[PDB]
Amino acid sequence: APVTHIWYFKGVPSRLGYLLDLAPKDLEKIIYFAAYVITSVDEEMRHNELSTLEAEMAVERKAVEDQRDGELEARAQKLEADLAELEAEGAKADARRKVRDGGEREMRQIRDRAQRELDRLEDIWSTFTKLAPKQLIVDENLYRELVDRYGEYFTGAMGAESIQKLIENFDIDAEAESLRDVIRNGKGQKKLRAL
Amino acid sequence: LYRRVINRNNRLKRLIDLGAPEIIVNNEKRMLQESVDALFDNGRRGRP
Amino acid sequence: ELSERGEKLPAAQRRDMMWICRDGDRAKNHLLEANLRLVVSLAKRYTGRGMAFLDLIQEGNLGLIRAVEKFDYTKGYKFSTYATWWIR
DNA sequence: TGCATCCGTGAGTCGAGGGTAATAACGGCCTGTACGCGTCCGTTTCCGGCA
DNA sequence: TGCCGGAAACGGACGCGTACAGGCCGTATAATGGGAGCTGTCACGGATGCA
Lengths: 195, 48, 88
Description:
The structure is cut from a larger assembly and holds two copies of chain A and one copy of chain C (88 residues). Chain A has 195 residues and is mainly alpha-helical.
């Protein structure tokens, strides 16, 4: 398997980082198998499947909220059973509401878990729709979920092979022209970094 | 250093053609990378 | 066996057999990842002479791979007992 | 934007000087490597006659 | 005395029968995430991450 030369990655100035516009910490994470990196991404397929992927997300969210309201109605039936079993026998005033408070807490934690799942799906969709090359994907679990849900439309590896592919898909002429434009037009810190 | 490089490269080859989980394969690849880094410049990164 | 000179297997049959073939590999990797801890625990004590700790660990996972290839369930023994010998 | 944190580099010159932590151990086999007298080429004495 | 012209052992190539050198395989109760050594220089420059 390929390896990366230590001189051009670790040093006073990071040559690999300067060439790829990557921070040295992120570069170390990439080439030391601590974070995935997106080698390349397609534009036409994402562009023309955005609508159907949004529809699929809406359908999945509708299924999750249907499960949520099923949980709500199950909790309502459980609360009715608790009311029947507590408001018909001899019990303390606090004891007849202890079960109600417990059921309310269970309902709150259920809806909290549902909200967490909704937020997770939302951020997965956001990072898919804002995907771009030279982007690190921490949370290997999140990356794996993104891959299995969206195996197409992009490719992403991690390590020396990924860095080699990134260098392969690179345009030195366009990069030089862009940096020249930046050094002409920008000011201050951006101009210094561009230089 | 050359022995470590050769040993880790050979072990990576054996793991690859045998078929191993991504965790072990990536660990061996990192092993090879760190060994090559030590060979080229020992103590540049991490404990020498 | 059935690829050469075989038959055009039914779509459902072929997909189910491919699925179980994939699931076998999935289970093998699951077991390997689960039992890497035994490998590192056993390799914690062979350090200090010649090899490095991580190299010993890698040889341990090689031994564990061979152990899972040769392992069987019909004898009713725990997996750790059989894996320790191969790892060592 | 400023501030702290961190990293990396260099900081003498001439003799005198040389050897280290840390445990299953066997059967079955198997192919390979070697290597020890004998008869050949060849080189250091042989000895029969001799000048 | 020395020389001539072969003659006597001391050495290169061996099938053969044996020695062993080295390598592979396999062991069944159970055991399931490290030791570890550090951190008494001083000035300089610069890159990076965050308020």
